[PDB]
Amino acid sequence: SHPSPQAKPSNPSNPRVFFDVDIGGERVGRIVLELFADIVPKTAENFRALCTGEKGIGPTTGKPLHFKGCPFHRIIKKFMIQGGDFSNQNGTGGESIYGEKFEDENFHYKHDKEGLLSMANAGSNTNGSQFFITTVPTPHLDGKHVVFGQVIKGMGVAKILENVEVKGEKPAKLCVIAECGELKEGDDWGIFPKDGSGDSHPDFPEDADVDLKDVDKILLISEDLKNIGNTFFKSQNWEMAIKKYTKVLRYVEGSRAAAEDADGAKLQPVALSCVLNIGACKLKMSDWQGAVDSCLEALEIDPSNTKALYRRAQGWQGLKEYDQALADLKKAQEIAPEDKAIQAELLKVKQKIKAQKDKEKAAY
């Protein structure tokens, strides 16, 4: 067996197909896959056709030979995600474009990395329509399952799938291939989020065209995304604003990790402002622990940030952790003694503590 291809794609002439994935009725993103037609032409072609649905209705199932609407029925964190049972949706059905089952074509490639596309089966020469995507190397499957493609965009969507809540191995939420098909050469990738916001960047920075070491370009992307987050903020859509600010932090994280210390420092102002904005949104939604956690993140960038101390004390008040709230506001006041909002909030918390202690000790 041969190591699986490191380049993405392995071969410019290999077909590319995609899955748009929904979880609990919400679009999570697109996964783009390379199919290894240069090595397993028959297995690749089966999967390609099931992405387009072009072969029509399966004779043995009487259902469309097509992945659209098909759930991921079996998911095991830190192993794989399995789907493709378009007829029974539970691992007992599906069929191939060649008949109910077809032969193991070859076992050329090793299951030696995450992101590999491989045929599910019930033993030798029992390939149908079901597949899995690995999320780790799975060499124990070598020689038993035909490896026939790899993820080339959207591994991060596959990572979200792998981490869904499950009962046994069945997702609690419906995880489905909402749309699917084949990308022709010259077709747009279609991997920006389909959320009407005008965002032209992939949700995961490793999928973006930009070198993550190019901090100046990452800064301009971050500003673009932050701006879109603010568009949502100004329309009170706290959830979507947080989504965009959070995406700025993914780009910032990837870049700071790839770049040198001093280059990465350039991104801190924009990261700080997005973490603060997220804390603001979480307070708007009464997510007290979420706010507290985001404020910490801010103080980990700027330990003297009075905005973050003030908001953290508000999050602590929601949790009814008034000692924590008092301490944060006292520290904020020391830094910013002229801040009237902080003066007033300290009085308010002191009154809350007294009232709480009075209620706890009062007796008829």
Three-state SS for 190-242 is CCCCCCCCCCCCCCCHHHCCCCCCCHHHHHHHHHHHHHHHHHHHHCCCHHHHH
Catalytic, out of 48, 74, 111, 256: 74
Catalytic, out of 11, 79, 237, 250: 79
Nearest residue to 61 via CA among 94, 101, 99: 94
Nearest residue to 268 via CA among 244, 297, 292: 297
> 1-184: what CATH class?
mainly beta
Rounded Cα distance, 152 and 56, in Å: 27
Whether 132 sits among the annotated catalytic residues: the reply is yes
Catalytic, out of 33, 141, 326, 329: 141
Q: Who's near 338: CB < 8 A, 6+ residues apart?
A: none
Catalytic, out of 131, 132, 148, 233: 132
Catalytic, out of 30, 66, 73, 145: 145
Whether 121 sits among the annotated catalytic residues: the reply is yes
What are the extents of the domains in the chain?
1-184, 220-364
Catalytic, out of 11, 106, 121, 343: 121
Are the beta carbons of 280 and 261 closer than 8 angstroms?
no
List the determination method. Answer: X-ray
Whether 74 sits among the annotated catalytic residues: the reply is yes
Q: Which fold has domain 220-364?
A: 1.25.40
Whether 130 sits among the annotated catalytic residues: the reply is no
Whether 145 sits among the annotated catalytic residues: the reply is yes
First-to-last alpha carbon distance for the chain, in angstroms, is 81
